[PDB]
């Protein structure tokens, strides 16, 4: 006359989840896997951080205008914007991918005097599109002109040893005129050639005079070189035009970081994923965000959403 | 489930139990009842909460950049560049869609299977004095109060005591 | 299986069985007989079936040349090339092979439980009337027609009719 | 008296599969989910398609004379044969595969006229490597001699500027003759130098001269260059010799696919995955043919069957 | 352990079976005794016998090298090199971490099925003559001696011969 | 009154696994699957090992006074050692990874004269830089001076046709002096050029005197230039200074490996992956020792152990 027995709970609405052999079951509780949504800041607490503004980072080796409170800089975030640029006077750099995945990491850099000195020649080049209150040339580089118009140019040879115990970066440049009247006016008449020798670096440099389409009002161009210094060694640089004199030498420290944003800072925060848009912020494994995050990231998948099972099937009453 | 309990010989579940996974239901002379089970439900979350912890583990790697996005690079090498990533998506992407499908697939069975241990367990404890009717519970052949029901309920059963009347009352 | 029904204390199949998975076989004074089970077949196919659609599920993604067969490329960059295809055979062809062998694994296990079940329910319906034999066999202690025999394939089998006499042939 | 029974169904032979602690298992049915055959034909249809013969990719931007009815095409999928050839006179490009890569995905090319004209020189250079109904030269290109036998050649300079909204692509060349006495004969005597210029590009170049093996007959070469043209810029060439004169701009239109095979055109078919041997049409995710397959194709294995499971374990009567 | 034998109603194990993974153990008027079951200790040695193998299969691929530690690189491809170095590492680990813990998850649950089978087995061998006390130990209703007990172990049981009496006996 | 029952068997010490839903489950028994033991040798029993010492890898070809021994040698296993060394005279070669890339596969080398005849000029240019048995050159290239100190050097050119069936290598040399006037005392004065033709190739070359930092007590350097032959073409050679001619062809033979070690070699072992610190022997499927093995080796992880479970859960009698 008496009976007892069991069961189980339900809920009035389920969720649906996949299984191997079917899509769509349902039950109580589900949770998500993949992650969505972003802080439109760059947060970033706990660490020195560096925000280029209309430097570029190849600019602070060089020393245009625009950079002259970059020259020495310490951080641990390296920031870059669209807007910046490296050259006052036309010109680029060969082989520079590299050198700026090299510079993204360095933490800093470190300037040292080289000590060169020059006799019967005019070391103060200076051009109207690099102004900072009148005409200048670069804040690190000398522009090696002749004594007088259409004079000469003695064959000259300089030497640098390094004595540190790391290695050093070493940057040149050769001039290419608008004309070959210019290459006259400015070095005298007759052929130029440059060399460059080290140990393992023996390279030999001659300009090519033309004309070309007017940027910045100049015809002219630069183009800049570098080099990497083992601690012991020793650099020569044979001219006789055409040269660009370095005047310092660089050395990194420590380590850091960089990446490229548009967006805005914030000091008071905490991450370690970044990309051009923001942080990500989650402890979800999977991520549908952007595909070139740097830092320590969750995994890219292409699904928009993953719901992991919970609870129990749900068989609701009648 | 596998087991064919849950959605099985039990044909739905109670809305009204909200303080458990499993549970008993009573009626004899004095009235009705409703209780819930512990040691069940315990099982089921530890490793429902188990599994949870053990995807949440963070694995530490750095990575950095590799290409530019303000100046483009030299195109044989963005082209290798953007098939390795194209190639490593694809793998990523079915990793985890497998891994979601089998945990899921897990979950129910686990849930089933603890069900069914549990009506076993209820079931082994009533010899010869109880018999079952099929819909999934089962029917008593003395009087039993609510002292003899909480007793059911903790393992606390003696079958020696009303085995006599029992057997007479299912002989004849 | 790991339910020990296939292969375990049912000796070998039937191979007169040709509508079905699974079946009735009985025998009483009038004669023998054969049938077959519906529910158990189509939940067997049903899964079987969403198995094979999520195989053949298609994912979009485009891929083109790198490389070219008239003319060579460059050794240097040829090598990182050949060496990166090598590296990604290798993980396909161990997904592969780790996604059959756990489908395998499973579709075995399914059946045997479904035959599990069946057998059971069936045991379930015949309470305190029919005895076991340890084969998969029941034996009945009342008469039982063709009427009989096919109200208890469909469930809708009364045992209070025949309560009496079974008790009665069992005692004695 | 009566008796009840169950049981299962079994066939008379099975198939053996393996599972995930035993090999060769028998069951009653299985299916295999890799792919071993093809169709030895390019299936395509509801897609233009151009079949280059003996013009090789790169010609139509010249315009050898096998190349005459490629000049302008336009097609969805663009097959080369293994014959094809992209040069009449003796010589070679500089940076093929980027530009190969590029013209692949193009979808066709359309030519603009540039406007150059000349005055004093003669720009009417053939030769008998490249016969049309007798001497002549590529059919997009000028070759500017001299006046007369060993005599001068003025320094000139020449510019082009963009006007459409897409980039645009242009491609010079550079001679090296024989001997040198052939340089005099020619383009007169003493240095020779080009240069070429733009916004981001300031290049020299310089021939020179020697003797070599003879093909074709001929013991001369000619080095084709090209550049990419921003959509507001400006191009210039300074020559005082040796230069080959450019006559039309290319601008590229819509996309494309492109495949390397050796079987004929099929045009009552369907595919999206071809290789070298023909297409593969199948719904099963792992195939065993060919690991350079290019569209949307299934996953490559090494394994050359893998049988799954459809039935239950078989068990046959004694 | 979603069978609730091993660490379920049987409450621990014995230290004294040294000659296989299951037994029995019988006590009567005569005295105590203890034997051991040989087709379920192959049957789960087998199949761990088979993952081991399966797990050692050795696949044939060779690489070479593609960068030098004596003498180092240019830059921009060695960045690409190590890039996808450290892309392929974190799919092995993963992958390794993986196939361990599925393995490690299914083999518990096939001891746990083997040790529920054969006593499902054993209980079905006795019908009717003994009965169930719930911790996995059986209660005769008549007089067994070592014949009766070696004859029980080997499938040699004949329920009949002592149907009477032990029906008497649990009647009375 | 009797009883029989059912049991399983236990022990005192368990080891603990990982699970899907647990970390720390107690079993029977247990074993490991990852490798962290090797050998501290370099096992390699049934093949032929060259063992270079002082002689670098790329030395063979070009013959320096420590590589006298392995002009023409035959290999299945090369090892390199950090000591080794490829140049006599201050100098370095060009692309030379891929050549090392070429060479580590090659299995040996075999030469072939080539038949250079010289009229007039000298060929036993001698440095003090390679000692034999007193001041002596590379022992497969050749020295082209003038008759006498600052004296002409005529024009000459020369070819040779490949006749075999396989591709063969050649190698030259361009050399630049320490000063102008160094030119001038052993080539003569006025300008210098070469020129290398084939099908295939065409390249042009000129020195670039200047003052570098000494090494090896010399100031000039020699920069070593290659190419590969098909197996039916023909090579000319037009100069008139700076030129080291090549005296021998090379052909490769069969297939080897390569790698880079430190220890020592056993003669009696058996192993087929290798490593900077020795072999790996084992059938474990994952290694933790290094990620640049070479040959057939398990895969790499980073996890230091993985349990495999061996038997049942672990519960003892209390
Ligand atoms: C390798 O893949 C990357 C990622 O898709 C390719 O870069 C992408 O190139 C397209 C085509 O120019 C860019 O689209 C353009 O973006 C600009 C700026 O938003 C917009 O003004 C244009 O209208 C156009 O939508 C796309 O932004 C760019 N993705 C980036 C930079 O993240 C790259 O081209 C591929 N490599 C090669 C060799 O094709
Ligand atoms: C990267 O791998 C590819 C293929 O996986 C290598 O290309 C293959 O190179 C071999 C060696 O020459 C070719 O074998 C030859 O085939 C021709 C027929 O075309 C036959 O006449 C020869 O006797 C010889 O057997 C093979 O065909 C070719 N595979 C292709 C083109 O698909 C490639 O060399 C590897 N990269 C490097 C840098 O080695
Ligand atoms: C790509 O990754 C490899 C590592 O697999 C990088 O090579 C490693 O570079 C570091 C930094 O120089 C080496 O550490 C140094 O080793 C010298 C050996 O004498 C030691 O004296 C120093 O104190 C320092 O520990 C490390 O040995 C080296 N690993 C090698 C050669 O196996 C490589 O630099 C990476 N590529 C790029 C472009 O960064
Ligand atoms: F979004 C996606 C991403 C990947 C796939 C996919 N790719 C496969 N390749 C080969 C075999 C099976 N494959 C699947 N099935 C998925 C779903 C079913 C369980 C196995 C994994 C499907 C959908
Ligand atoms: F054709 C192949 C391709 C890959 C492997 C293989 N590689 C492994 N590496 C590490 C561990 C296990 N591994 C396996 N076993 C396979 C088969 C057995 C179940 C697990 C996956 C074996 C044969
Ligand atoms: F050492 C490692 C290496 C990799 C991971 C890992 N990363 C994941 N990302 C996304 C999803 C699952 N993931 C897992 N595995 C989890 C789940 C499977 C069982 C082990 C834990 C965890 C620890
Ligand atoms: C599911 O779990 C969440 C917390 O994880 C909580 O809201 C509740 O327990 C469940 N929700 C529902 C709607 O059942
Ligand atoms: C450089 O080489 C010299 C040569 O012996 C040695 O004395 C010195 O310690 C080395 N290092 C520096 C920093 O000079
Ligand atoms: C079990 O329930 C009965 C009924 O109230 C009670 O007397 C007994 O103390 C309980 N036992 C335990 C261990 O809680
Ligand atoms: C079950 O089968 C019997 C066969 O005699 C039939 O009479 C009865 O209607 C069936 N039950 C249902 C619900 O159809
Ligand atoms: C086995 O499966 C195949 C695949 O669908 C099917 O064509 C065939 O009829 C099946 N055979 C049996 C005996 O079930
Ligand atoms: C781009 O070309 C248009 C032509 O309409 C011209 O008006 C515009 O000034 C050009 N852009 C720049 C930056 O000069
Ligand atoms: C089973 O054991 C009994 C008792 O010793 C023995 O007589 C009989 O022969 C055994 N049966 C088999 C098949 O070994
Ligand atoms: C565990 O296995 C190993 C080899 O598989 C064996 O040597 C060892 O004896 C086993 N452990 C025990 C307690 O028997
Ligand atoms: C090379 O070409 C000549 C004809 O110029 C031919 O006789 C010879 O057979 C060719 N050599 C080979 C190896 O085919």
């Not at chain 1, 005298?188 to 140990?199: P, Q």
């Not at chain 1, 923001?278 to 402890?283: A, D, E, K, L, V």
């Not at chain 2, 309920?153 to 009347?165: I, P």
């Amino acid at each position: 006359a008496d009976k007892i027995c069991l069961g189980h709970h339900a809920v009035s609405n389920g969720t649906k989840v996949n299984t191997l052999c079917e899509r769509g079951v349902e039950v109580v509780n589900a949770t998500e896997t993949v992650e969505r949504t972003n802080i439109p800041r760059i947060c970033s607490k706990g660490k020195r951080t560096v925000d280029l503004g209309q430097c570029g980072l190849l600019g602070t080796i060089t020393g245009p205008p625009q950079c002259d409170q970059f020259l020495e800089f310490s951080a641990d975030l390296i920031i870059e914007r669209r807007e910046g640029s490296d050259v006052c006077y036309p010109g680029k750099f060969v082989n520079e991918e590299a050198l700026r995945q090299i510079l993204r990491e360095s933490g800093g850099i470190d300037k040292e005097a080289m000590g060169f000195t020059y006799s019967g020649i005019r070391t103060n080049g200076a051009t109207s599109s690099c102004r900072r209150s009148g005409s200048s040339f670069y804040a690190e580089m000398k522009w090696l002109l002749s004594n007088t118009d259409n004079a000469a140019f003695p064959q000259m040879t300089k030497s640098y040893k390094n004595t540190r115990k790391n290695p050093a970066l070493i940057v040149w440049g050769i001039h290419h005129s608008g004309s070959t009247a210019e290459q006259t006016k400015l070095y005298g008449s007759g052929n130029k050639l440059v060399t460059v020798g080290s140990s393992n670096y023996q390279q030999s440099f001659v300009p090519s005079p033309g004309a070309r389409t007017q940027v910045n009002g100049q015809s002219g161009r630069i183009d800049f070189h570098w080099l990497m210094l083992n601690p012991n060694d020793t650099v020569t640089f044979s001219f006789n035009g055409a040269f660009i004199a370095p005047d310092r030498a660089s050395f990194l420290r420590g380590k850091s970081m960089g990446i490229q944003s548009g967006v805005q800072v914030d000091a008071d925060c905490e991450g370690d994923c970044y990309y051009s848009g923001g942080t990500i912020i989650s402890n979800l494994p999977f991520q549908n965000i952007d595909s070139r995050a740097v830092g320590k990231c969750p995994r890219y998948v292409k699904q928009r959403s993953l719901l992991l099972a919970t609870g129990m099937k749900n068989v609701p009453e009648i | 489930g596998l087991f064919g309990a849950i959605a099985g010989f039990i044909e739905n579940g109670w809305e009204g139990l909200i303080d458990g996974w499993y549970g008993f239901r009573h009626q004899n002379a004095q009235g009705e009842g409703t209780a819930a089970d512990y040691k069940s439900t315990q099982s089921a979350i530890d490793c429902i909460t188990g599994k949870l912890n053990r995807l949440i583990e963070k694995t530490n790697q750095q990575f950095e950049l590799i290409d530019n996005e303000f100046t483009e690079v030299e195109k044989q090498i963005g082209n290798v560049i953007n098939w390795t990533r194209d190639s490593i998506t694809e793998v990523w992407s079915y990793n985890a869609e497998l891994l979601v499908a089998m945990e899921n697939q897990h979950t129910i069975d686990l849930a089933d299977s603890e069900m069914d241990k549990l009506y076993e367990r209820v079931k082994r404890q009533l010899r010869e004095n109880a018999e079952e009717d099929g819909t999934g519970c089962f029917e008593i052949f003395h009087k039993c109060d609510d002292d003899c029901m909480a007793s059911i309920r903790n393992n606390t059963y003696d079958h020696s005591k009303y085995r006599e009347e029992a057997m007479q009352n299912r002989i004849q």
